[PDB]
Amino acid sequence: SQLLEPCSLKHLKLRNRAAVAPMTRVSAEAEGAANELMRDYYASFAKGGFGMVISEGIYTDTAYSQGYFNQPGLATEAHRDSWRLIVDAVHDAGAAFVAQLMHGGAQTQGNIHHARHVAPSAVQPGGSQLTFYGGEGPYATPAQISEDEIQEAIAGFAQAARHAREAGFDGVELHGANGYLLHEFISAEFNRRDDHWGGDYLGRLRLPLAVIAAVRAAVGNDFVVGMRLSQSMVSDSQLKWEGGVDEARQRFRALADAGLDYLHVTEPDAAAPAFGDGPSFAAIAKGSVSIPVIGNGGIVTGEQAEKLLTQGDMDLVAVGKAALANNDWPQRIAQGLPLNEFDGTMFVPMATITNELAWRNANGRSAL
Numbered sequence: 001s002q003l004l005e006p007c008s009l010k011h012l013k014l015r016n017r018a019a020v021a022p023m024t025r026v027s028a029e030a031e032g033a034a035n036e037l038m039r040d041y042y043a044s045f046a047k048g049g050f051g052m053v054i055s056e057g058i059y060t061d062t063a064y065s066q067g068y069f070n071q072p073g074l075a076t077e078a079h080r081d082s083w084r085l086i087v088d089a090v091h092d093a094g095a096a097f098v099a100q101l102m103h104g105g106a107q108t109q110g111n112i113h114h115a116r117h118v119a120p121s122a123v124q125p126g127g128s129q130l131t132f133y134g135g136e137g138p139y140a141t142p143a144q145i146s147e148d149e150i151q152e153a154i155a156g157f158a159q160a161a162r163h164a165r166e167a168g169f170d171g172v173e174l175h176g177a178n179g180y181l182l183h184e185f186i187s188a189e190f191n192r193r194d195d196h197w198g199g200d201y202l203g204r205l206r207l208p209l210a211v212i213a214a215v216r217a218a219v220g221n222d223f224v225v226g227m228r229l230s231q232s233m234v235s236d237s238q239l240k241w242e243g244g245v246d247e248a249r250q251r252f253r254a255l256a257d258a259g260l261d262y263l264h265v266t267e268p269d270a271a272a273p274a275f276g277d278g279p280s281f282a283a284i285a286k287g288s289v290s291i292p293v294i295g296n297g298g299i300v301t302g303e304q305a306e307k308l309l310t311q312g313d314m315d316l317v318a319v320g321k322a323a324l325a326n327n328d329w330p331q332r333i334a335q336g337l338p339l340n341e342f343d344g345t346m347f348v349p350m351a352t353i354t355n356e357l358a359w360r361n362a363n364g365r366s367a368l
Ligand SMILES: Cc1cc2c(cc1C)N(C[C@H](O)[C@H](O)[C@H](O)COP(=O)(O)O)c1[nH]c(=O)[nH]c(=O)c1N2
Pocket: 021, 022, 023, 024, 025, 056, 057, 100, 175, 177, 178, 228, 266, 296, 297, 298, 299, 318, 319, 320, 321, 322, 351
């Protein structure tokens, strides 16, 4: 019942507390524009009753930001205009639509402008490239990003956010998670800089704080700006935030107090303790800031979502795999209908919309 309670997010009035989590589908045009297949794809979640749809990570600039081939952008006016009809379709079905803004950093696998990658420090990520986005084998070692490249990246977030607002999105989500550029700056392991972008766990927030400030100047004070945060990285799902609960509370507070309107946190298991003992990562955030907290990670069933909301571990519930398994997830929960089990073969060999549609046709598994 709490899942189907309306809520407010700044000036936005959301019909329920169900959100579609951001998911990279590498189904845009080769030079970054969104398209009609993406229109139908995103509209389907809105028709399925989600109160809020968060886009896949959208790149921000025409320099290093693009992380995957056929990833959409918001860097140019052509990119902006290509999203308009998608925004309109999601809105016509009654969902708010938030543009996730992301810079690939050290986790880039394909970028049409450069083979060179940039990161706070020249440290190769561990793990291995995600083949279903295009690419195989070890991550490249990134070049240490320069002050001029940092300023270009900040300006790109601001411009992409202004483009999101102009295209009609209801908000932006700054991608500070999952091992991408902003998270690399947050992290102790990968931000080894000795300048004013490095330091202790608070000093390392300076780049995300600068991005928040620049974005807020570009979009004004009435537009929704959130940030996604995680301990995990795509290159290392076991990584922890330095310290424990108290240092986590301080990061959440610093970022929120810079003028975010929500936090979105993601963990391998949203219900598990963040630091081995004690509260979940989402619960820590919700107990340290007044703005809404969207939680995420392994939330599959209606009962699981309801438990997280009714226990006070989060204000909204973002689902990825469950939304792909049933685009009408919130409606099916209300009707007591069974859910489909998520089946990762739908992403083989590339996680594109086209491959999903072929898989659904072969398996009789309608999204709605
Ligand atoms: C195909 C695909 C693509 C992406 C993701 C996932 C999947 C399956 N995830 C992570 C996603 O938002 C979510 O956090 C995880 O899938 C875990 O939550 P669920 O268990 O799926 O509810 C992700 N997260 C994000 O912040 N930006 C992104 O672009 C993507 N890309």
